[PDB]
Amino acid sequence: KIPRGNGPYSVGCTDLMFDHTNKGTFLRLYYPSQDNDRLDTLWIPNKEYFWGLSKFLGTHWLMGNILRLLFGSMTTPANWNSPLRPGEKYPLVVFSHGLGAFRTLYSAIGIDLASHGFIVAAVEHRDRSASATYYFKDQSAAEIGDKSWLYLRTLKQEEETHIRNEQVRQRAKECSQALSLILDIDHGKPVKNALDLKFDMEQLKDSIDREKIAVIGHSFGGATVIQTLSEDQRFRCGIALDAWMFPLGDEVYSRIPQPLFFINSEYFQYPANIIKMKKCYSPDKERKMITIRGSVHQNFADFTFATGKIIGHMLKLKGDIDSNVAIDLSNKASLAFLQKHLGLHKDFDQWDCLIEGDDENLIPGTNINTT
Numbered sequence: 322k323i324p325r326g327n328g329p330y331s332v333g334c335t336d337l338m339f340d341h342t343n344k345g346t347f348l349r350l351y352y353p354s355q356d357n358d359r360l361d362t363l364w365i366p367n368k369e370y371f372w373g374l375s376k377f378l379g380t381h382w383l384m385g386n387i388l389r390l391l392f393g394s395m396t397t398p399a400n401w402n403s404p405l406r407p408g409e410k411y412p413l414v415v416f417s418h419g420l421g422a423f424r425t426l427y428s429a430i431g432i433d434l435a436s437h438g439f440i441v442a443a444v445e446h447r448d449r450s451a452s453a454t455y456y457f458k459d460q461s462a463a464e465i466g467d468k469s470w471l472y473l474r475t476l477k478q479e480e481e482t483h484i485r486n487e488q489v490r491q492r493a494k495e496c497s498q499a500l501s502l503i504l505d506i507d508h509g510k511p512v513k514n515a516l517d518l519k520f521d522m523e524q525l526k527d528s529i530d531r532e533k534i535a536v537i538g539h540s541f542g543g544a545t546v547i548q549t550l551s552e553d554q555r556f557r558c559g560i561a562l563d564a565w566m567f568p569l570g571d572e573v574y575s576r577i578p579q580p581l582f583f584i585n586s587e588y589f590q591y592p593a594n595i596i597k598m599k600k601c602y603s604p605d606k607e608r609k610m611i612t613i614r615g616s617v618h619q620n621f622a623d624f625t626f627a628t629g630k631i632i633g634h635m636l637k638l639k640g641d642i643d644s645n646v647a648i649d650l651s652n653k654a655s656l657a658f659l660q661k662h663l664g665l666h667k668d669f670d671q672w673d674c675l676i677e678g679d680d681e682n683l684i685p686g687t688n689i690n691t692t
């Protein structure tokens with residue numbers, strides 16, 4: 322089980338695709354909800370995501386069918402299409418997924434943020450970094466629900482530097498585009514969701530605290546945070562969860578005026594990556610770094626909750642640390658950081674000590690030596 326949020330708000334979830342094309346925005350929305358008696362949200366909602374995962378693993382497509390058998394009925398505890406909780410303006414997080422992931426695999430984070438009064442837009446990237454994603458070729462296809470699928474692109478070593486940079490820039494553009502869509506819906510623009518879902522987008526009108534925007538992401542999504550900040554000053558701070566820094570161009574490092582928080586796992590990181598993070602530092606800039614003790618790269622994503630303890634540790638989905646404990650730390654520390662740099666008037670400053678890595682399961686800064 323993916324944990325419920327630790328906050329006071331019930332959580333809703335829905336999907337938005339606008340426009341319907343491969344250049345449109347696709348996101349999964351997590352939001353504070355009015356009601357708590359809805360069906361839970363299907364975690365991986367189409368068979369094609371499993372085929373995507375199987376290609377990402379480098380196995381036959383029939384491993385995909387087996388994955389679907391194992392995980393295809395699994396839910397996450399958000400009230401599917403529940404009405405938005407009215408009467409309050411919510412700050413906004415745009416969330417970016419990692420390589421081979423897609424929009425639905427960070428519900429533990431999105432749910433928990435939502436439970437504390439954030440609206441969270443988990444984008445699905447169309448850069449071929451997702452295991453799978455979909456869209457519609459034209460208006461006819463969207464009407465009848467004739468999905469076209471786009472699968473993970475595998476790269477030759479000769480393509481890595483160039484194509485990973487092209488992708489992170491596209492990812493950044495997709496984050497900015499997703500922000501603009503949400504802000505336009507906030508400002509009342511009719512938007513016909515290309516997915517025929519019983520969640521009226523007009524609910525979001527006047528529901529966003531329009532200056533309180535952050536960008537968060539994991540792995541490739543952590544590089545995406547940084548690229549995004551460098552090109553869209555509407556994002557007021559960023560949180561990079563175990564960032565994979567390789568995609569970033571040399572130019573971005575000096576170009577991030579906003580506060581930025583690195584939350585790392587103990588076992589993922591390596592000197593080349595850490596050196597790149599430290600290139601983001603300068604005395605005028607607000608930078609924080611913590612490392613979760615006994616954690617692995619997958620502690621930030623939902624598959625850390627999908628299998629047992631034993632098989633979890635074998636597959637590197639789990640680390641030495643308990644998964645709920647690790648994500649509570651990442652999420653609470655994130656909450657404190659967001660409150661500080663978005664100027665929120667909540668109680669998230671109770672976790673200020675976690676930003677400085679003051680906790681028995683935190684290492685201040687990094688365990689990685691870079692000499």
Ligand SMILES: N#Cc1cccc(S(=O)(=O)NC2CC2)c1
Nearest residue numbers: 419420421422426540622623624
């Ligand atoms: N859950 C989950 C999940 C599924 C697929 C890929 C990811 S990743 O961490 O973005 N990709 C990194 C490992 C290379 C996470």
Ligand SMILES: [Cl-]
Nearest residue numbers: 358359360401
């Ligand atoms: Cl329902």
Ligand code: NA
Nearest residue numbers: 497552553554
């Ligand atoms: Na921009």
